[PDB]
Amino acid sequence: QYRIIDFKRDKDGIPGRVATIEYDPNRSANIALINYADGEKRYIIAPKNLKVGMEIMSGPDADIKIGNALPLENIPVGTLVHNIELKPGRGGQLVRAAGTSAQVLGKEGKYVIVRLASGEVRMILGKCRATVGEVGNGGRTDKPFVKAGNKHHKMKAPNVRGVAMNAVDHPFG
Amino acid sequence: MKRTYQPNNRKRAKTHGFRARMKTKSGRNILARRRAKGRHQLTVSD
RNA sequence: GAGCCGGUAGCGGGCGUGGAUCCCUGGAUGUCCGAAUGGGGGAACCCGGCCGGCGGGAACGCCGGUCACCGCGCUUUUGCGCGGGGGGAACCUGGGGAACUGAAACAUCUCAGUACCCAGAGGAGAGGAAAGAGAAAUCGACUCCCUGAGUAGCGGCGAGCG
RNA sequence: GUGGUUCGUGGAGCCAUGGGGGAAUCUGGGCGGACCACCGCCUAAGGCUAAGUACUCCGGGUGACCGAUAGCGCACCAGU
RNA sequence: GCGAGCUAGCCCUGGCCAGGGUGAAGCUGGGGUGAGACCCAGUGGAGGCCCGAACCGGUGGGGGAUGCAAACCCCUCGGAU
RNA sequence: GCGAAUGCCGGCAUGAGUAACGAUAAAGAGGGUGAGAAUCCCUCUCGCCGUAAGCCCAAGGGUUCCUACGCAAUGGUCGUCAGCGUAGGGUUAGGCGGGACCUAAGGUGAAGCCGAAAGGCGUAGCCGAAGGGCAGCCGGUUAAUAUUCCGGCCCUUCCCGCAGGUGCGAUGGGGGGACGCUCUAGGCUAGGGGGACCGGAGCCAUGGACGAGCCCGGCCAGAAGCGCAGGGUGGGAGGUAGGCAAAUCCGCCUCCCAACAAGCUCUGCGUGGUGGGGAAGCCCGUACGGGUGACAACCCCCCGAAGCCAGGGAGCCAAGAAAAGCCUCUAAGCACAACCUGCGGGAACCCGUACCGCAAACCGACACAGGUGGGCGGGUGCAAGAGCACUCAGGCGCGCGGGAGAACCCUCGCCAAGGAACUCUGCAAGUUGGCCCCGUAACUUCGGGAGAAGGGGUGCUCCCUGGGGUGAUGAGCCCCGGGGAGCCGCAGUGAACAGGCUCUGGCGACUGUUUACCAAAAACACAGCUCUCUGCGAACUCGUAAGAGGAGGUAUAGGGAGCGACGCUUGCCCGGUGCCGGAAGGUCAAGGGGAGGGGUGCAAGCCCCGAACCGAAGCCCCGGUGAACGGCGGCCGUAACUAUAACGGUCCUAAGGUAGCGAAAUUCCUUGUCGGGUAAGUUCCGACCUGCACGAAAAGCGUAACGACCGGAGCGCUGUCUCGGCGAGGGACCCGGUGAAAUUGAACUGGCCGUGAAGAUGCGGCCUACCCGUGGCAGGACGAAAAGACCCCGUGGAGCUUUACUGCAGCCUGGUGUUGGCUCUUGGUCGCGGCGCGGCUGGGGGCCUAACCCUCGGAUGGGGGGACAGCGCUUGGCGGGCAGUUUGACUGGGGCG
């Protein structure tokens, strides 16, 4: 419903309980309200799995318990993640419903290796974080916009195209 | 038929009105232009 | 110096040589807008603290006065007391700044540092006692008029500029 | 690397500066047009300075200047 | 310098589509197999979906040509959550 | 010193007493006033609305509104009429709307951030609305106002007092106001309908009936008290590793009461009691009638919302805005005086109202059949319904009237007999048009193509029968069959609104969207595919540096793109070009860096030219590259009794067209040749295929459905046509009233055959030839419109293009700067193939790191990057993205030549 919310933990020792299935319409991410100890909440990432009955978190400590997330430092090798913590705390550093996250495919000193979900590879840094678990996007792909144009229903630009025009109009155009 | 005249108090006013002109460099300009220059009254005055 | 209540000549009424109309200059009022500046705003409207009479408050309580924008100095103390800004036909220097058109094209060039826009000074600014000019060991502020001179000279050495 | 100057890249200086190096306090330090010797001038890298020229909104004067389609377009409940 | 009270858009915020028709997901029940696939029947009510007013339009013909009008009148037509 | 510039300005004639009265929703009659009335007032027939030609709220316009006088001009005629003139007068609110409250976009904007200056952005706060919020309603009352004035009924906020009560006491917090769409239960006013059941004013004329007969109405609003009706939340303790920066609030975990319980916000009764209340109505206009007095009646059953309770419930996806009130509390003061309550007295503003308002008062310059947003829109009939025909309330007859009825244009109605042959074309029109039953083909992505195609039904009468709402169900109402019998007309959706169907082909799939005043299409758009730049502080787009956008997106993503479902399938060539990679080698800018020469120099010196070598991207050179640009051979021979071919011979090219298709909308020789369709068919449709010049990605062959697309054919039907011929309403014609307009030197302007500058009323010869007019018919006056748009000419202009010229924007790029330390290293060089050293100086690799930047993540500290780079200066380069010029003459037309 035209809004944002959470995206980056950094208060821990906190109790992570899988709020609920609030599959969400606004970023290809499907998240559920994450119930913290105090009671303070957050429509959190959609890293598939972690059943309703919440039951997680993270921590400077550990707990690969699927989903959840800590610094690079605190992370296995051969592991699949998201909550792409690029720079030191820059919260998320990639993978948006981009299921196929990154896989600490080898780390090095204040530098941890990452399979570039998108489609390449290089390294991050020290404390830098990132929570494993999948994504959530049920292949958020495909699906037919049949005899109409989902598009429009887009609210998402018919910013339509052209290319053939009659003129000689717009940038590199 | 829809000409182009349908005036709109709110509108026309707003849009044009002592102020504005003022607020502006330009506006201001001509304005004090008109002023002397011509005499008369002015927009909003309208 | 003896007539008047403006252009209105008209009705109805009136001031005046124990110096009226009007001519001057310095005044006190100067409602609302407008740099506006207390606050808001489609100008000429609608809103707020302090003082204020106290006011009809017939045995019941309000306008008036006021006041305060913000950038400037700095007696800094908690900052109290001075300047500004908005104009303005034309003219002034700085800041920025163009094609036409001429060259019988047009890229150099010209129109020009013009036209315009901007800022700002003034009643005038501009500028102004020389690391100046030139060469007779000669001259001396800056400015402006005539002259130097359409010369010395700049140049697709062309139009021109000069 | 541009300016202004008569100088449109030129044998091309002075003064003014966009970037980078970054001297001297009187035998110092620019200058007289590449530069150099000698001569001659001047003393910078802060400031103020009325008067002599310009301009007419204003007021006056004067006209081989006009007369209501001329003159400012507008001689009077016109920049309406 | 002047303009989106022209028009093309885009942001914000309300209003508006008389009637009718077609009958997919589903859920209920029944159906030979292990469960099922899957069938059928009921319910059900989607779709830039159909038939059509207002409303949006303005092909196809008719008039009009110093018109009613610097684009309009007439018959006709498409769209119609 | 002026005809004279389609000259400017002013007047004034033309056509011309012909053309027009702004919708073919028509009028006509009696009286009245007046100088004078088709055009005014009263009255009586008649016609048009009626979803309007209704009242209403807005926006816009602002006295246009009323009343008494008046018509000079505006009223396209009059005119005593006016939305025209002068004068006077009219619109009042604690509760309606705007503010004295709230914010999203957006706009402003102290601080903050960047510009040559003007300026740009912009936090918080403020501006900003029929979005949020907020305390009333019905009747009366003037010439006009009215939810404001009357009155009857219903309230709210502030203040002072006292009475009672309780930690009151910010707005900081928390809930909180807060919402999508499609759909639907339960209940109820609005609204409608039958009542012959109640009240009353009268009638019946006519043949008939005084009868459940005709005609009016039988309602509107309300303290709470009160039962149908729902409508919203649960209730205690404790822990509060403690949040929502600060504690009791709410958020989160644990144990008990965890219902149809109790809670708190709209409709019915009603009913306090008021009003209305029509038909009156004795005084009074018995008439511009009605102002104001009987009594009214005040009742029942029926239908029933597309938004009344309500923030419903159910489903769905594209998954639905922020600040007053309520409770928690710090500062803080009350805490015998702070807030809640009760009663009594006291206070309540600023500006808006008239009338118009699907409009002569609003935009179209005009009383112009143009547009303009919301509210039920009364009924009867039609399956339903703001569609339709008639009409209710209310509105109006178009502001020019008579008179003839000729041609002729308009709109409309009809036909025999034929029934498209008319013609480019069934363009038009006419067929057909509504609901029920029967019945439905090729093909299919099985949904559809079906309303397909093709019939048959419908009207009013009586009979017996079955159903769902009807509080049981018993004058009441509805959906409905049923089946039987029967009546009438040419006809029985009787009128009115209402598809022609089929057979085929081509393109594009499809609903679309678009060139406002020609073109709605095979044009774009697409859902869908493929290459593809991009790791964030993205990449591209605006921007002078900030900055926004992007995106609070993050590779199932964001931008660049050529095609444009789905199916089937996309082959061959990287020699040139763009690009991606390479960077060893050639080249080469600024620059370092020295041989050497030069000028002056008595001399130390003092200026230049300077070159060997080191030196950047670029370009040259190697490769990779096709849903990147682009291209994808020629002729001679041969079984072929005749013809490419199965094969063979070759010259050039980078290979040298593949699968599908084919005279297609790419095939001019052509109406190509064969076939079908026909009385013949240069359109079609099938097939061949020597494809003048298809071809897979600006796709290629096909493809159900789909199209106001285009083309081909058959049934149906009609004046489209064989000529039509009749008619109805409207101008045209005669009357009265009014009364333009472009063009025009001027003119009393005939035919001829000849002529002239070679298409003459005006010149020659001749022949007919009285003067004027009106209703017409087009030929000539080279008629009107417009100093040709097709043409060439001006070394005119303006837009797009690339290996045109140049230059800038941006981008890449060497050295230089605020760009600091530490170490690892190889190269040059001159000196003393060499090695040792030496100054020189060049390359480069590293965490750091103190600039710089960024970073943030809750503070100024940490973190990351870091000598980068941003960014300044010079270098060089790409560079049609843009800016400015240019691209000759001849020419027995411009060009090509």
Q: Residue B20: which CATH number?
A: 1.10.287.3980
Residue A74's nearest CA partner among A58, A98, A87, A90 is A58
Indicate the resolution in Å: 5.9
Q: In this structure, are residues B28 and B22 in contact, taking their beta carbons and an 8 Å threshold?
A: yes
The residues that bridge with A71 in the sheet, in sequence order, are A129
Q: Is A142 helix (H, G, I), strand (E, B) or coil?
A: coil
Number of C-beta neighbours around residue A138 at 10 A: 13
- Distances A108 to A95, A103, A130, A158, B26 between C-alpha atoms, Å: 22, 14, 16, 46, 63
CA dihedral of residues B7, B10, B13, B16 (deg, nearest 10): -100
DSSP of B4-17, one letter per residue?
Answer: S----SHHHHTTS-
Alpha-carbon distances of B3 from B6, B7, B10, B16, rounded to whole Å: 7, 11, 19, 20
CA–CA distance, A32 with A12 (Å, rounded to integer): 19
Q: Hey, is A114 helix, strand or coil? A: strand
Q: CA A97 to CA A163: how far, in whole Å?
A: 31
- In order of A64, A145, B4, B12, the CA distances from B42 in angstroms are 75, 57, 21, 13
Q: How crowded is the C-beta side of A14, counted as CA atoms within 13 Å?
A: 20
Number of domains making up chain B? 1
Contact indicator for A134, A49 with CB cutoff of 8 Å: yes
Which residue type sits at A92? Answer: G
Q: Which nucleotide shows the minimum CA-to-C1' distance to residue B25?
A: F118
From the CA of A26 to the C1' of E23: give the distance in Å. Answer: 34
- The set of residues, in sequence order, having a beta carbon less than 8 Å from that of B23 and lying 6+ positions away, is none
Distance CA A106, CA A124 (A): 11
Instruction: Report the C-alpha gap between A16 and A72 in whole angstroms.
Output: 19
Tokens of A12: 């821990």
Whole-angstrom distance, CA of residue A168 vs CA of residue A151: 27
Read off the tokens for A108.
């090095």
Alpha-carbon gap, residue A123 to A107, rounded angstroms:
8
User: Cβ of residue B10 near strand E, that is under 7 Å?
Assistant: no
Give the pair of three-digit tokens for residue A142.
């495909």
In whole angstroms, give the CA distance from residue A124 to residue A87: 7
Provide CB contacts within 8 A for A130, sequence distance 6+: A69, A71, A72, A75, A81, A82, A83, A84, A85, A93, A102, A124
User: Which positions ≥6 away from A71 have C-beta within 8 Å?
Assistant: A60, A85, A126, A127, A128, A129, A130
Compute the distance between CA of residue B30 and CA of residue B35 in angstroms, rounded to an integer: 8
Cα distance between residue A30 and residue A140, in whole Å: 10
Burial (CB < 10 A; 0-12, 13-18, 19+), residue A95, is buried
Give residue B39's domain range. Answer: 1-46
Q: Which nucleotides of F are covered by protein (CB under 7 A)?
A: 59-61, 118-119, 241-244, 251-253, 318-321, 362-364, 370-371, 509-511, 523-528, 534-537, 540-542, 552-557, 559-564, 800-801, 855-857, 862-865, 882
